[PDB]
Amino acid sequence: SMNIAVVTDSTAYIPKEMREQHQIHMIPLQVVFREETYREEIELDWKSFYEEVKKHNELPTTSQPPIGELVALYEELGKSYDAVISIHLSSGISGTFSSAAAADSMVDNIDVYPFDSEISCLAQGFYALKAAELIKNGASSPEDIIKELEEMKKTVRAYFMVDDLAHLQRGGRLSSAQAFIGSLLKVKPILHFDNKVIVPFEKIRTRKKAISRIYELLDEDASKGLPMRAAVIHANREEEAAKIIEELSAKYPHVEFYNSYFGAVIGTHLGEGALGICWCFK
Ligand SMILES: CCCCCCCCCCCCCCCC(=O)O
Ligand SMILES: [Br-]
Ligand SMILES: [Br-]
Ligand SMILES: [Br-]
Ligand SMILES: [Br-]
Ligand SMILES: [Br-]
Numbered sequence: 001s002m003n004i005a006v007v008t009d010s011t012a013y014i015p016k017e018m019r020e021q022h023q024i025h026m027i028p029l030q031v032v033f034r035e036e037t038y039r040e041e042i043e044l045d046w047k048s049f050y051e052e053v054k055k056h057n058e059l060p061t062t063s064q065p066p067i068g069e070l071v072a073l074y075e076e077l078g079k080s081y082d083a084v085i086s087i088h089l090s091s092g093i094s095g096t097f098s099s100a101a102a103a104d105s106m107v108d109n110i111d112v113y114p115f116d117s118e119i120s121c122l123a124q125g126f127y128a129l130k131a132a133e134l135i136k137n138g139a140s141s142p143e144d145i146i147k148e149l150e151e152m153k154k155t156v157r158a159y160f161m162v163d164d165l166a167h168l169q170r171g172g173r174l175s176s177a178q179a180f181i182g183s184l185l186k187v188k189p190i191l192h193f194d195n196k197v198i199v200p201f202e203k204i205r206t207r208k209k210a211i212s213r214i215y216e217l218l219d220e221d222a223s224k225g226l227p228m229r230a231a232v233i234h235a236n237r238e239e240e241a242a243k244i245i246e247e248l249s250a251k252y253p254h255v256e257f258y259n260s261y262f263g264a265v266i267g268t269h270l271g272e273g274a275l276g277i278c279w280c281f282k
């Protein structure tokens with residue numbers, strides 16, 4: 001029956017060729033520099049970001065997409081589609097989600113179904129892949145697709161570490177956590193999402209130990225022998241990510257592994273040297 005489009009914001013970091021394969025449209029968030037503000041992924045790739053930042057001593061900030069651009073995308077989309085699955089980074093770390101919702105009453109020709117992925121990066125990307133796959137196999141209810149995504153959210157996991165805690169501190173997305181701890185985070189932990197916001201998952205002494213702990217955490221799901229997607233995400237640490245994927249994929253042939261990155265908007269908050277691993281059931 002009805003035609004359903006799929007949208008995600010840039011911070012899902014789905015490779016552009018893969019988005020084309022799967023019919024996934026994308027709305028960029030912004031990275032703000034001293035002179036220029038860019039639309040990430042389209043106007044600034046991840047290597048340029050980390051290169052620009054260190055060779056200009058940039059202290060970038062980020063912005064959600066202008067509500068105007070969301071509306072324009074939906075209006076355009078609505079000429080060929082009845083509904084859009086609009087998938088976004090956590091409502092606890094960005095106003096993007098709530099702008100997608102508010103943009104729905106601003107467009108007549110399409111029904112927007114905002115989905116709070118309560119996460120970001122390729123973990124959020126995974127929801128858009130599932131949505132496209134469902135749509136490809138004749139999913140004709142936007143509601144049924146959303147139900148599907150919410151169930152999948154039950155088993156999506158992500159753990160990550162940063163090199164310098166200062167970037168997160170600066171961007172403000174450790175506020176909730178620190179509001180609950182009652183004080184200031186000084187030592188680097190494993191981080192994860194809990195109730196839509198970033199919080200320490202566990203105290204750890206070294207990055208090496210953090211990775212090994214995350215391996216254990218992955219094994220808990222990877223050991224069931226059920227089909228999975230997983231991504232090792234880096235902020236300018238591609239070789240390190242590749243060694244991890246080399247070792248992990250050998251160990252888990254049933255887990256499809258992606259080498260992915262923190263782009264300009266997310267890397268603005270995590271900082272170069274950040275590393276994480278996420279996964280979910282296919
Ligand atoms: C493999 C692990 C992936 C986990 C994803 C971590 C996301 C980093 C959180 C901080 C970024 C906040 C973005 C704010 C954008 C805006 O200004 O609205
Ligand atoms: Br792009
Ligand atoms: Br329409
Ligand atoms: Br509408
Ligand atoms: Br479905
Ligand atoms: Br630090």
Ligand SMILES: [Br-]
Binds near residue numbers: 172174175177198
């Ligand atoms: Br926060």
Ligand SMILES: [Br-]
Binds near residue numbers: 188190210
């Ligand atoms: Br660490």
